[PDB]
Design a protein around this motif. Structure first.
Motif, short mmCIF file in Angstrom:
data_model
loop_
_atom_site.label_atom_id
_atom_site.label_comp_id
_atom_site.label_asym_id
_atom_site.label_seq_id
_atom_site.Cartn_x
_atom_site.Cartn_y
_atom_site.Cartn_z
N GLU A 1 0.84 -1.19 0.00
CA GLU A 1 0.00 0.00 0.00
C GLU A 1 0.87 1.24 0.00
OE1 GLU A 1 -3.44 -1.21 0.87
OE2 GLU A 1 -3.15 -2.53 2.60
N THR A 2 0.49 2.25 -0.77
CA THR A 2 1.33 3.42 -0.94
C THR A 2 0.54 4.69 -0.64
OG1 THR A 2 2.84 2.42 -2.57
CG2 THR A 2 2.55 4.80 -2.66
N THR A 3 1.15 5.65 0.04
CA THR A 3 0.47 6.91 0.24
C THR A 3 0.63 7.77 -1.01
OG1 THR A 3 0.20 8.88 1.63
CG2 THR A 3 2.36 8.07 1.37
N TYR B 1 4.34 0.55 1.91
CA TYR B 1 4.50 -0.49 2.89
C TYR B 1 4.32 -1.79 2.19
CZ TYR B 1 3.58 3.22 6.23
OH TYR B 1 3.62 4.40 6.95
N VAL C 1 -2.16 5.28 5.98
CA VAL C 1 -2.50 4.38 4.90
C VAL C 1 -3.64 3.51 5.38
CG1 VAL C 1 -1.56 2.81 3.23
CG2 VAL C 1 -0.08 4.32 4.48
N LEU C 2 -4.70 3.43 4.58
CA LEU C 2 -5.81 2.56 4.90
C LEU C 2 -5.58 1.18 4.29
CD1 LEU C 2 -8.55 1.90 6.03
CD2 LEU C 2 -9.55 2.70 3.87
N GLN C 3 -5.50 0.15 5.12
CA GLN C 3 -5.25 -1.20 4.63
C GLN C 3 -6.57 -1.93 4.38
OE1 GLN C 3 -2.55 -1.20 8.65
NE2 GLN C 3 -3.25 -3.15 7.79
N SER C 4 -6.51 -2.98 3.56
CA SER C 4 -7.70 -3.78 3.25
C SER C 4 -8.29 -4.44 4.50
CB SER C 4 -7.36 -4.83 2.19
OG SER C 4 -6.43 -5.76 2.70
#
Lengths: 210, 210
Positions: A162-164, A179, B164-167
């Protein structure tokens, strides 16, 4: 109940002059001098830029000027500087005692000195591993302009990422983070993992290993 | 001038929150006051206004029947009761002081997150080390988290990145400082992570890798 209308985006260069429109109806911008303008940088509260249509509060750069004509208000910014890169909002009193904001304008200031990204890459902390989890962190900073592509490798095969979206540092440049989430065994498996950052025609790559 | 907000955090859909704001550095009882909100994606929406005496009270269309504004001029406080909340009420809520049909001072705002999920505090891991050291603030809900270094004594080289919003449904962010390599043994680096929505505060000491 409809907002004042502004252009969503304006891209201009350093030293240029820009004008941002804000259109309303007779009940707001038309009949009152209750027109104010606000600037908002990222992660911070709006600040007042212009009030009573054309008045500048002290502290505000005089490169900023306001006006109106009929139901249209104008915010003008002379000699664009890099700090002017912000969101701008129109606002007005409305008959009935309400206030209404413009939908917002994002201002991009283009012609700035290009900066290449510095990349820093962190393996999972020991304490995270003790908690049965792995997470690699790739931090990118100091790059202008703001567009980057972030890829991840395991040894050399491409890869839970995941990337900002890049963001205001913002003195001149941007920053982002990516991340890679791993299970600790997947962390223990491959010889190395890489973080690849692609910016303009350069790509900076970093590598860690268990 | 200070406008310090409070209240906020997580609330289930249909539920209710009180927000308050305490005001100093100006004569509170001589000004009209407002609340304004901003959803994560979009712009400023004016929400409510209360006159100097508290005798007149105005509301935006999408808020009437549900929000109540009030003020207390002996305690210099302003309050917004927000009821029957829907996910679309998720926003930063600023209190804003009126000059005269404009808003010259804004609070930093409180984030209201309306969801059926539950609260979860962060797990704070060290990213160990010019060197860069940092903190990985992982798996919290909802936003926001604030980060200071060494009780706010340390300012330079600090960049806290967006979350960061994760799944999974949880957030995670990191904060990084760039320090002269020559001080890894002499200076102490402590990241202070405040997660007000869970009443959790966590200080982590970062030390050089083994």
């Amino acid at each position: 109940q409809s907002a004042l209308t502004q252009p969503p985006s304006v891209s201009k260069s350093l030293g240029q002059s820009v004008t941002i429109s804000c259109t309303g109806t007779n009940s707001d911008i038309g009949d009152y001098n209750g027109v104010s303008w606000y600037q908002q940088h990222s992660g911070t509260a709006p600040r007042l830029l212009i009030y009573d249509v054309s008045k500048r509060p002290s502290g505000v750069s005089d490169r900023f000027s306001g006006s109106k004509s009929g139901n249209t208000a104008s915010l003008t910014i002379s000699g664009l500087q890099a700090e002017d890169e912000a969101d701008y909002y129109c606002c007005s009193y409305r008959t009935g005692g309400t206030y209404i904001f413009g939908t917002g304008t994002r201002l991009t200031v283009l012609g700035q000195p290009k900066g290449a990204p510095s990349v820093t890459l962190f393996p999972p902390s020991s304490e995270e591993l003790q908690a049965n989890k792995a997470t690699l962190v790739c931090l990118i900073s100091d790059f202008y302009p703001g567009a980057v592509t972030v890829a991840w490798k395991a040894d050399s095969s491409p890869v839970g990422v995941e990337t900002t979206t890049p963001s205001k540092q913002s003195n001149n440049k941007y920053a982002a983070s990516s991340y890679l989430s791993l299970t600790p065994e997947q962390w223990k498996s491959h010889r190395s993992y890489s973080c690849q950052v692609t910016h303009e025609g350069s790509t900076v790559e970093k590598t860690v290993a268990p | 001038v200070q406008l310090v907000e409070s209240g906020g955090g997580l609330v289930q859909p249909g539920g209710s929150l009180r927000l308050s704001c305490a005001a100093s550095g100006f004569t509170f009882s001589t000004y009209g006051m407002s609340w304004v909100r901003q959803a994560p994606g979009k712009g400023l929406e004016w929400v409510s206004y209360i006159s100097i005496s508290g005798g007149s009270t105005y509301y935006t269309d999408s808020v009437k029947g549900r929000f109540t504004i009030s003020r207390d001029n002996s305690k210099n406080t302003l309050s917004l009761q927000i009821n029957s909340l829907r996910p679309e009420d998720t926003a930063v809520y600023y209190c804003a002081k009126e000059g005269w049909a404009y808003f010259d001072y804004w609070g930093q705002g409180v984030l209201v997150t309306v969801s059926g999920a539950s609260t979860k505090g962060p797990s704070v891991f060290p990213l160990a080390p010019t060197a860069a050291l940092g903190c990985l603030v992982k798996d919290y809900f909802p936003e926001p988290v604030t980060v200071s270094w060494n009780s706010g004594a340390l300012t330079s080289g600090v960049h806290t990145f967006p979350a960061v919003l994760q799944s999974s449904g949880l957030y995670s962010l990191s904060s990084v400082v760039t320090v002269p390599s020559s001080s890894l043994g002499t200076q102490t680096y402590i990241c202070n992570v405040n997660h007000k929505p869970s009443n959790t505060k966590v200080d982590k000491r970062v030390e050089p890798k083994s």
